[PDB]
Write a protein that binds this ligand. Structure first.
Ligand SMILES: C=CCSC[C@H]1Nc2cc(Cl)c(S(N)(=O)=O)cc2S(=O)(=O)N1
Ligand SMILES: C=CCSC[C@H]1Nc2cc(Cl)c(S(N)(=O)=O)cc2S(=O)(=O)N1
Ligand SMILES: N[C@@H](CCC(=O)O)C(=O)O
Ligand SMILES: N[C@@H](CCC(=O)O)C(=O)O
Ligand SMILES: [Zn+2]
Ligand SMILES: [Zn+2]
Ligand SMILES: [Zn+2]
Lengths: 258, 258
């Protein structure tokens, strides 16, 4: 059977090619995760179809209804066979789906417009002039919501009650907000996305401070799926043969505009 | 039953306590992995005994005989229930044992005596005045042995044939060799150990260049062991609550001597 791959439009993991309308199937997309999928499938010996997650989300469990949305949801409810995306390995997710060893490392980080008077999370927490928020429905939000650390609980306390909302529906929305707010908004997002955007025109944002945590993205499959074994091994192999580092440079730094 | 934990004397993961000559059982030891074991066993609800691996090795397979030595062999042959140590996740190991998600990140790196005229692996490869080597029966050696990369292959070709041997039986041997070779020996070892030593008297070594690869340590169990599941989830939990970051700072930078 052809493996259904759920993924998500997020630069530079997966992007529409500048001419997709004249192309079909997997050929419409490009990016780090597009390249990885081809490699995973070749080594694991399967055919596959990339499909963009319907609700444009990563995956969260609705408190009350207990329904999972996003890519996680499509794996849990049987819509997809595998997720190849910047999907963060987390405990609540590991409880309902299987993750391979990480194919890329990241930490929550701070994006500012250049010249913004901010060096750290502690800095953000001690003031109110500069607003700050995170993506919706993602691991970054949950990090803050669940945190017992001082600086982080205070930040959550501010963020949850800020109005207008400091949360964004997409990474692009967050970046645009930083860019348009003249230094009055900072965005909390994963280091990988932060570093990509830092290398893109108009070159007006930067990552500041150390990361808030340390984790990674994993390739995910439905709990107990037979795919898991092969896919995990393929990730280790590709990692050892230098493919992942090659892809990272290809899509982040080789392209560099700044 | 009491879990038999296999581990290895390797600073600052597992070290004999000072007062040492007065304690019994697990109490004899201190370090990152010592603290990690306690936490894991707490959250998984088991009692355990720390045992120092008999042959003092991480684990590799004898080509010719195909028998695994080191901590890997102790799991494969049934002498131990779990390994908690700076044990690198690799493809050939994953094929015979199970690893949790990584609990710490590292990459292969270069340690020099301060002032040694070397800035990179390329630098090492381009010259002969300064000898260099790696640990025996570990993942770093295998890295070079199996490397297709131009720079590293040339380094391996030199290393496998050098005389006197440039390989060492333990990290401590490698480090003493850098320190007493007046800059004529560079040691290839994992960034984690390199950074620890760099902050310890006599403060005469340093890490130079960037990491050659990106990987991680995992807690290992015999393949298909039931313990594996609980252990993995315990690592995730510990990661998310910040204990892992707590432990790292305790054993690396809070110690700082330089
Ligand atoms: C869902 C998560 C899968 S990976 C979790 C992760 N945990 C950590 C924690 C720490 Cl403190 C470190 S570090 N900075 O001490 O090295 C590294 C990692 S990880 O990236 O190896 N995995
Ligand atoms: C623990 C078992 C297998 S881990 C293999 C590893 N691969 C890489 C590769 C890269 Cl290039 C990166 S990075 N530097 O681009 O973020 C990260 C990882 S990993 O640590 O997530 N896993
Ligand atoms: N990688 C995150 C989404 C981005 C973020 O939350 O910063 C996730 O899997 O939920
Ligand atoms: N961490 C390595 C040992 C140290 C090294 O090879 O540099 C292993 O698990 O084999
Ligand atoms: Zn003694
Ligand atoms: Zn605990
Ligand atoms: Zn032999």
């Amino acid at each position: 059977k052809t493996v259904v791959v759920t993924t998500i439009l997020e630069s530079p993991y997966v992007m529409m090619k500048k001419n997709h309308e004249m192309l079909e199937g997997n050929e419409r997309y490009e990016g780090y995760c597009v390249d990885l999928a081809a490699e995973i499938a070749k080594h694991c010996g399967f055919k596959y179809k990339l499909t963009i997650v319907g609700d444009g989300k990563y995956g969260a469990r609705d408190a009350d209804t207990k329904i999972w949305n996003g890519m996680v949801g499509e794996l849990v409810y049987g819509k997809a066979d595998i997720a190849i995306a910047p999907l963060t390995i987390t405990l609540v997710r590991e409880e309902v789906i299987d993750f391979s060893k990480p194919f890329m490392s990241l930490g929550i980080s701070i994006m500012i417009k250049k010249g913004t008077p901010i060096e750290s999370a502690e800095d953000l927490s001690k003031q109110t002039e500069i607003a700050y928020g995170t993506l919706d429905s993602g691991s970054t939000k949950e990090f803050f919501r669940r945190s017992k650390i001082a600086v982080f609980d205070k930040m959550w306390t501010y963020m949850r009650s800020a109005e207008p909302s400091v949360f964004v529906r997409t990474t692009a929305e967050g970046v645009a907000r930083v860019r348009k707010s003249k230094g009055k908004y900072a965005y909390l997002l994963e280091s990988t996305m932060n570093e990509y955007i830092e290398q893109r025109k108009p070159c007006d944002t930067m990552k500041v401070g150390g990361n808030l945590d340390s984790k990674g993205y994993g390739i995910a499959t439905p709990k107990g799926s037979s795919l898991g074994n092969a896919v995990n091994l393929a990730v280790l192999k590709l990692s050892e043969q230098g493919l992942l580092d090659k892809l990272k440079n290809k899509w982040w730094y080789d392209k560099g505009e700044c």
